[PDB]
Amino acid sequence: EVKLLESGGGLVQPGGSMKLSCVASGFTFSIFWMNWVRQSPEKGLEWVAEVRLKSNNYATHYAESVKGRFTISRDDSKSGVYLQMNNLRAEDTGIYYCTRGYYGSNYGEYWGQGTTLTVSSAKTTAPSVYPLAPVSSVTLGCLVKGYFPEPVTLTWNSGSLSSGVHTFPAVLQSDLYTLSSSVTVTSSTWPSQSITCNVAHPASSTKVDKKIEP
Amino acid sequence: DVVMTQSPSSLSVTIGQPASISCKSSQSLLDSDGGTYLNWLLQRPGQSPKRLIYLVSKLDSGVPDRFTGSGSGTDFTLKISRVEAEDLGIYYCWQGAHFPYTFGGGTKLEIKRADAAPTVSIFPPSSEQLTSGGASVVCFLNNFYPKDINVKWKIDGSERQNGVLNSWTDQDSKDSTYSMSSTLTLTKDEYERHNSYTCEATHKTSTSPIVKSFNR
Ligand SMILES: [Cl-]
Ligand SMILES: [Cl-]
Ligand SMILES: [Cl-]
Ligand SMILES: [Cl-]
Ligand SMILES: [Cl-]
């Protein structure tokens, strides 16, 4: 199976540096060009860099806005392609995908799940979690307030409760994100059973569970 | 950088209906080797973009025959013979005839379904929040259509517009409905000095707005 394991994202202050890694497996690495592709709500999808084979001494091609700042490289031994990023600005914020081969032809469709990069001056803040109890069926809620940066992972009952769940996308307000989630179960299960909102924020090393009580 | 222009920006289609997406490039995508390097890709929110078509009309494995690419030079078209609910997401065109490789702006495909009323629910601040000095009242609006909807807040009669954070989920792939969260944020000093709070949803699914309220 073709796998492109990306890592090395996270929060970095403007003007700072960061190196992204892409460890590839499931195919012969040295015979494929490797690419970095990024995505942001402002600029959409953008090709960042391309690196070619060994015989051409690993020729590199970059997008204009990253020339002189970004450097793509590959280590055929470790089966890895890397993206060294210097002098980062806010516009570099987004999701970075590692892709295999020429995208315009066959065999070149594979992209990795990507890793997120956040370039900001705002500091890391822990989320405030508030279990939401109600005032036919019963609707429960959970409030993840005031955290930075993205992302957080909200699950219900350690991932057991998966149906009837609406996790709402994060909203940025004053350099702080706010996320909420709703759960709808049959009234015969709650408060008969126990329903707990599980929120994890790895940036602030946060793993907090909040039980819902009437 | 070759500019890829997509039209329209948003596409709303009923199940079974045919639909098409246009893509025009600033320069010809016909390369010297006789090949025309244009891709069609689809992205479902939160997930990695998946390629559907390469070389104008060649389909990747797994991609249904309902998707058909065509065109030449600078003009290209993606055609969906009969739209299914799982076809939703953002479609992008992409050129590989010139570096830097460039993407189109994208075309969001919305599944057109029957009108559905929002299942509204209001929530007073928690015990942890009030004792911490803050106060947020949360109003949930689950499983509704169309997406166009607005929530008005009311505190002891009058309304407050500041301190409101709204968030829409992406269109569900199964029931084609939308969900929306509205959080009114203020202080405990502002909260304890009032009793009744109300989130008022104004949808076209009803003449009178759907109302949930509490008194504390
Ligand atoms: Cl595979
Ligand atoms: Cl992967
Ligand atoms: Cl191989
Ligand atoms: Cl270089
Ligand atoms: Cl290299």
Residue numbers in the entry:
A (entry chain H): 1 to 52, 52A, 52B, 52C, 53 to 82, 82A, 82B, 82C, ...
B (entry chain L): 1 to 30, 30A, 30B, 30C, 30D, 30E, 31 to 211
Paper quotes:
GroEL is a molecular chaperone found in many bacteria, whose expression is upregulated during stress conditions, such as elevated temperatures or high concentration of oxygen radicals. In the current study, we generated and characterized 13 IgG2a mAbs specific for FtGroEL. And we map their partially overlapping target epitopes and those of three mAbs with other crossblocking profiles (Ab53, N3 and N30) by hydrogen/deuterium exchange - mass spectrometry (DXMS) and visualization on a homology model of FtGroEL.
The final Ab53 structure contains H chain residues 1–212 (with the exception of residues 128–133, which could not be modeled due to poor electron density), L chain residues 1–211, 186 water molecules, 2 sulfate ions, 6 chloride ions and one tris molecule. The sulfate ion makes a hydrogen bond to Y96 in the H chain (H-Y96). As the Ab53 DXMS-epitope contains five Asp or Glu residues (E355, D359, D361, E363 and E367), the sulfate and chloride ions may be mimicking carboxyl groups of these amino acids. The tris molecule is located in a pocket formed by H-I31, H-F32, H-W33, H-L52a, H-G95, and H-Y96, and makes hydrogen bonds with the backbone atoms of H-I31 and H-W33. There are two positively-charged amino acids in the Ab53 DXMS-epitope, R362 and K364, and the tris molecule may mimic side-chain interactions of these FtGroEL residues. Additionally, the side chain of R362 of FtGroEL in the docked complex occupies the same space as the positively charged tris molecule observed in the crystal structure, where it makes an interaction with the side-chain of Ab53 H-W33.
